[PDB]
């Protein structure tokens, strides 16, 4: 009695895609993780009484054109779109990742969660209000996380599972 969920973590270089994924799977914070390493991680968790197998792809994709990135966006069921709260450019980049995914899916309606990572850093440049407004405009949840302190790390991934589960009924 198990359900699979294929999750893809996307976002600009250095926002904490790897740190978030490794904190969820391995319960440690990576200080200086090779920016080019792209790996999948599988873990069983219980969410809302369901035993879930999470298959998570940690992407490191800054290529403009990539057959393999199109393939993982076709295969992925839900997308964690991560920016860093101290990097305005990473926040502006979200629009481009969302557009790429909608194009591959040929759908305006795709399970996504907006994640503002590095909430432990004091010098914020992205107002929580702007991030909430962007998420509202996309019709998706918004969560602020810290891969360093584990704040809302499970919540971000488990919220994305909940989004996928609900879309499966629509
Ligand atoms: O070759 C790709 C790999 C496989 C694929 C896509 N991108 C991959 N790497 C990222 C990449 C590679 C080349 C490139 O030019 C651009 C991006 S795939 O579509 O054929 N397989 C997918 S899509 C996917 C989603 Cl959407 C969610 C969860 C998944 O597990 C998943 N998978 C299967 C695993 C992908 C693992 C990333 N890899 C390798 C696989 C082999 C290895 C070495 C040993 C075990 N892990 C290194 C990582
Ligand atoms: N302070 C803080 N640093 C973080 C956080 N997440 C990641 N980092 C750091 O930011 C850098 C980039 O993280 P990484 O996970 O490699 O980013 P990726 O390129 O998106 O995979 C590393 O130096 C991490 O230690 C966070 O929540 N808080
Ligand atoms: Mg990385």
Short mmCIF file of C-alpha atoms and ligand atoms in Angstrom, two decimals:
data_model
loop_
_atom_site.label_atom_id
_atom_site.label_comp_id
_atom_site.label_asym_id
_atom_site.label_seq_id
_atom_site.Cartn_x
_atom_site.Cartn_y
_atom_site.Cartn_z
CA UNK A 1 0.00 0.00 0.00
CA UNK A 2 2.22 2.75 -1.45
CA UNK A 3 1.95 5.74 -3.84
CA UNK A 4 4.91 7.13 -5.89
CA UNK A 5 5.50 10.91 -6.32
CA UNK A 6 8.14 12.19 -8.80
CA UNK A 7 9.36 15.59 -7.55
CA UNK A 8 11.81 17.95 -9.30
CA UNK A 9 13.71 20.74 -7.48
CA UNK A 10 14.42 23.72 -9.79
CA UNK A 11 15.82 27.22 -9.32
CA UNK A 12 18.86 29.39 -9.96
CA UNK A 13 22.39 28.27 -9.03
CA UNK A 14 23.17 28.67 -5.32
CA UNK A 15 19.60 29.01 -3.96
CA UNK A 16 19.89 25.72 -1.93
CA UNK A 17 18.27 23.04 -4.15
CA UNK A 18 20.94 20.49 -3.12
CA UNK A 19 21.03 21.63 0.55
CA UNK A 20 17.20 21.31 0.78
CA UNK A 21 17.15 17.84 -0.84
CA UNK A 22 20.09 16.52 1.22
CA UNK A 23 18.55 17.91 4.47
CA UNK A 24 15.25 16.09 3.69
CA UNK A 25 16.90 12.75 2.71
CA UNK A 26 20.07 12.65 4.84
CA UNK A 27 19.37 15.02 7.76
CA UNK A 28 22.53 17.11 7.38
CA UNK A 29 23.36 20.58 5.97
CA UNK A 30 25.93 20.70 3.12
CA UNK A 31 28.14 23.83 3.26
CA UNK A 32 29.69 23.74 -0.26
CA UNK A 33 28.04 21.11 -2.53
CA UNK A 34 29.30 20.75 -6.12
CA UNK A 35 26.95 23.00 -8.19
CA UNK A 36 26.94 20.63 -11.21
CA UNK A 37 25.95 17.38 -9.39
CA UNK A 38 22.40 16.28 -10.40
CA UNK A 39 21.15 13.14 -8.59
CA UNK A 40 17.83 11.48 -7.68
CA UNK A 41 16.94 10.37 -4.14
CA UNK A 42 14.17 7.92 -3.14
CA UNK A 43 12.61 7.81 0.34
CA UNK A 44 9.44 6.44 1.88
CA UNK A 45 7.45 8.83 4.18
CA UNK A 46 3.87 8.90 5.57
CA UNK A 47 1.77 11.96 4.61
CA UNK A 48 -1.96 12.18 5.57
CA UNK A 49 -2.00 8.43 6.35
CA UNK A 50 -0.55 7.47 2.95
CA UNK A 51 2.79 5.68 2.69
CA UNK A 52 4.46 7.71 -0.10
CA UNK A 53 7.58 6.89 -2.10
CA UNK A 54 9.23 10.23 -2.99
CA UNK A 55 11.52 10.14 -6.07
CA UNK A 56 13.28 13.51 -5.99
CA UNK A 57 15.51 14.93 -8.75
CA UNK A 58 17.90 17.63 -7.53
CA UNK A 59 18.65 19.62 -10.72
CA UNK A 60 21.65 21.80 -11.47
CA UNK A 61 20.36 23.01 -14.85
CA UNK A 62 21.52 26.38 -16.12
CA UNK A 63 21.66 25.24 -19.81
CA UNK A 64 19.47 27.27 -22.18
CA UNK A 65 18.61 24.19 -24.34
CA UNK A 66 18.66 20.64 -22.89
CA UNK A 67 16.88 17.48 -24.14
CA UNK A 68 17.48 15.83 -20.73
CA UNK A 69 15.91 18.84 -18.87
CA UNK A 70 12.86 18.58 -21.18
CA UNK A 71 12.70 14.82 -20.39
CA UNK A 72 12.80 15.35 -16.57
CA UNK A 73 10.14 18.08 -16.87
CA UNK A 74 7.93 15.64 -18.85
CA UNK A 75 8.53 12.88 -16.24
CA UNK A 76 8.29 15.07 -13.10
CA UNK A 77 4.85 15.27 -11.48
CA UNK A 78 5.54 18.22 -9.15
CA UNK A 79 8.08 21.07 -9.05
CA UNK A 80 9.62 22.81 -6.07
CA UNK A 81 10.60 26.27 -7.48
CA UNK A 82 13.26 27.61 -5.13
CA UNK A 83 14.69 31.14 -4.83
CA UNK A 84 16.84 32.57 -2.01
CA UNK A 85 15.31 35.39 0.10
CA UNK A 86 18.62 37.36 -0.12
CA UNK A 87 18.85 37.10 -3.95
CA UNK A 88 16.36 39.17 -5.95
CA UNK A 89 17.62 37.80 -9.30
CA UNK A 90 16.80 34.21 -8.14
CA UNK A 91 13.23 35.41 -7.33
CA UNK A 92 12.86 37.00 -10.78
CA UNK A 93 14.19 33.76 -12.39
CA UNK A 94 11.15 31.83 -10.97
CA UNK A 95 8.94 33.13 -13.84
CA UNK A 96 11.29 31.53 -16.43
CA UNK A 97 11.34 28.08 -14.70
CA UNK A 98 7.53 28.14 -14.42
CA UNK A 99 7.20 29.09 -18.12
CA UNK A 100 9.63 26.25 -19.16
CA UNK A 101 7.60 23.68 -17.15
CA UNK A 102 4.20 24.92 -18.53
CA UNK A 103 5.59 24.72 -22.08
CA UNK A 104 6.82 21.07 -21.62
CA UNK A 105 3.51 20.09 -19.90
CA UNK A 106 1.35 21.98 -22.44
CA UNK A 107 -0.71 22.96 -19.32
CA UNK A 108 -1.28 26.21 -17.31
CA UNK A 109 -2.04 23.91 -14.30
CA UNK A 110 1.03 22.03 -12.93
CA UNK A 111 1.70 21.00 -9.28
CA UNK A 112 4.26 23.54 -7.98
CA UNK A 113 5.30 25.06 -4.64
CA UNK A 114 7.21 28.36 -4.41
CA UNK A 115 10.04 28.06 -1.87
CA UNK A 116 11.92 31.06 -0.44
CA UNK A 117 15.05 29.40 0.99
CA UNK A 118 17.73 30.75 3.37
CA UNK A 119 15.14 32.16 5.83
CA UNK A 120 17.93 32.01 8.52
CA UNK A 121 19.79 34.90 6.74
CA UNK A 122 18.98 38.33 8.25
CA UNK A 123 19.61 40.57 5.18
CA UNK A 124 16.48 39.74 3.17
CA UNK A 125 16.06 41.37 -0.26
CA UNK A 126 12.76 39.64 -1.24
CA UNK A 127 9.78 40.82 0.87
CA UNK A 128 7.59 37.93 2.04
CA UNK A 129 4.62 40.02 0.76
CA UNK A 130 5.98 40.07 -2.82
CA UNK A 131 6.59 36.28 -2.71
CA UNK A 132 3.04 35.67 -1.37
CA UNK A 133 1.66 37.89 -4.16
CA UNK A 134 3.65 35.95 -6.83
CA UNK A 135 2.40 32.60 -5.45
CA UNK A 136 -1.21 33.97 -5.40
CA UNK A 137 -0.82 35.07 -9.08
CA UNK A 138 0.32 31.47 -9.97
CA UNK A 139 -2.33 29.78 -7.70
CA UNK A 140 0.39 27.86 -5.79
CA UNK A 141 1.50 27.57 -2.15
CA UNK A 142 4.43 29.66 -0.81
CA UNK A 143 6.75 28.39 1.97
CA UNK A 144 9.90 29.98 3.42
CA UNK A 145 12.53 27.35 4.40
CA UNK A 146 16.01 27.11 5.86
CA UNK A 147 18.08 24.10 4.70
CA UNK A 148 20.59 25.24 7.36
CA UNK A 149 18.19 24.93 10.36
CA UNK A 150 15.66 22.43 8.70
CA UNK A 151 12.86 25.01 9.09
CA UNK A 152 9.88 23.88 6.91
CA UNK A 153 12.03 21.49 4.83
CA UNK A 154 9.60 18.54 5.22
CA UNK A 155 6.68 20.98 4.93
CA UNK A 156 7.91 22.23 1.48
CA UNK A 157 8.23 18.70 0.00
CA UNK A 158 5.07 17.33 1.72
CA UNK A 159 3.05 20.34 0.53
CA UNK A 160 4.13 19.52 -3.05
CA UNK A 161 2.94 15.90 -2.55
CA UNK A 162 -0.44 17.26 -1.36
CA UNK A 163 -0.63 19.45 -4.52
CA UNK A 164 0.06 16.41 -6.79
CA UNK A 165 -2.47 14.25 -4.90
CA UNK A 166 -5.18 16.95 -5.33
CA UNK A 167 -4.44 17.55 -9.05
CA UNK A 168 -4.83 13.74 -9.61
CA UNK A 169 -8.54 14.23 -8.61
CA UNK A 170 -9.08 17.16 -11.11
O1 LIG B 1 21.17 10.62 -15.94
C1 LIG B 1 20.45 11.22 -15.11
C2 LIG B 1 19.32 11.92 -15.59
C3 LIG B 1 18.21 11.17 -15.99
C4 LIG B 1 17.06 11.79 -16.50
C5 LIG B 1 17.01 13.17 -16.61
N1 LIG B 1 18.11 13.92 -16.19
C6 LIG B 1 19.23 13.33 -15.73
N2 LIG B 1 20.25 14.08 -15.32
C7 LIG B 1 20.15 15.57 -15.32
C8 LIG B 1 20.76 16.07 -16.64
C9 LIG B 1 21.64 15.21 -17.35
C10 LIG B 1 22.23 15.58 -18.55
C11 LIG B 1 21.97 16.85 -19.03
O2 LIG B 1 22.57 17.15 -20.20
C12 LIG B 1 21.10 17.72 -18.36
C13 LIG B 1 20.48 17.34 -17.16
S1 LIG B 1 15.63 10.84 -16.89
O3 LIG B 1 14.46 11.70 -17.31
O4 LIG B 1 15.96 9.78 -17.93
N3 LIG B 1 15.32 10.05 -15.46
C14 LIG B 1 14.63 10.68 -14.51
S2 LIG B 1 13.60 11.96 -14.61
C15 LIG B 1 13.21 11.92 -12.92
C16 LIG B 1 12.38 12.74 -12.23
CL1 LIG B 1 11.55 13.92 -13.14
C17 LIG B 1 12.19 12.60 -10.85
C18 LIG B 1 12.90 11.59 -10.19
C19 LIG B 1 13.74 10.77 -10.95
O5 LIG B 1 14.42 9.78 -10.33
C20 LIG B 1 13.92 10.93 -12.30
N4 LIG B 1 14.72 10.23 -13.22
C21 LIG B 1 15.62 9.05 -12.90
C22 LIG B 1 16.93 9.41 -12.24
C23 LIG B 1 17.61 10.63 -12.84
C24 LIG B 1 18.96 10.68 -12.17
C25 LIG B 1 19.84 11.83 -12.77
N5 LIG B 1 20.77 11.16 -13.78
C26 LIG B 1 21.96 10.30 -13.35
C27 LIG B 1 21.60 8.77 -13.25
C28 LIG B 1 22.85 7.94 -12.90
C29 LIG B 1 23.48 8.45 -11.60
C30 LIG B 1 24.84 7.73 -11.36
C31 LIG B 1 24.47 6.54 -10.54
C32 LIG B 1 23.05 6.68 -10.06
N6 LIG B 1 22.73 8.10 -10.36
C33 LIG B 1 23.80 9.94 -11.77
C34 LIG B 1 22.56 10.76 -12.06
N1 LIG B 2 22.45 30.23 5.28
C1 LIG B 2 21.97 29.35 4.43
N2 LIG B 2 22.76 28.89 3.47
C2 LIG B 2 22.27 28.00 2.62
C3 LIG B 2 20.91 27.50 2.72
N3 LIG B 2 20.69 26.61 1.74
C4 LIG B 2 21.85 26.53 1.07
N4 LIG B 2 22.78 27.35 1.59
C5 LIG B 2 24.14 27.56 1.11
O1 LIG B 2 24.06 28.17 -0.17
C6 LIG B 2 25.05 27.60 -1.05
C7 LIG B 2 24.37 26.91 -2.25
O2 LIG B 2 23.62 25.75 -1.84
P1 LIG B 2 23.34 24.57 -2.82
O3 LIG B 2 22.41 23.65 -2.12
O4 LIG B 2 24.65 24.04 -3.27
O5 LIG B 2 22.62 25.37 -4.01
P2 LIG B 2 22.08 24.83 -5.43
O6 LIG B 2 23.06 25.36 -6.47
O7 LIG B 2 20.72 25.47 -5.56
O8 LIG B 2 22.08 23.33 -5.35
C8 LIG B 2 25.86 26.65 -0.17
O9 LIG B 2 26.99 27.37 0.31
C9 LIG B 2 24.93 26.26 0.94
O10 LIG B 2 25.55 25.87 2.19
C10 LIG B 2 20.09 28.02 3.79
O11 LIG B 2 18.91 27.66 4.01
N5 LIG B 2 20.69 28.90 4.59
MG1 LIG B 3 22.99 21.84 -6.37
#
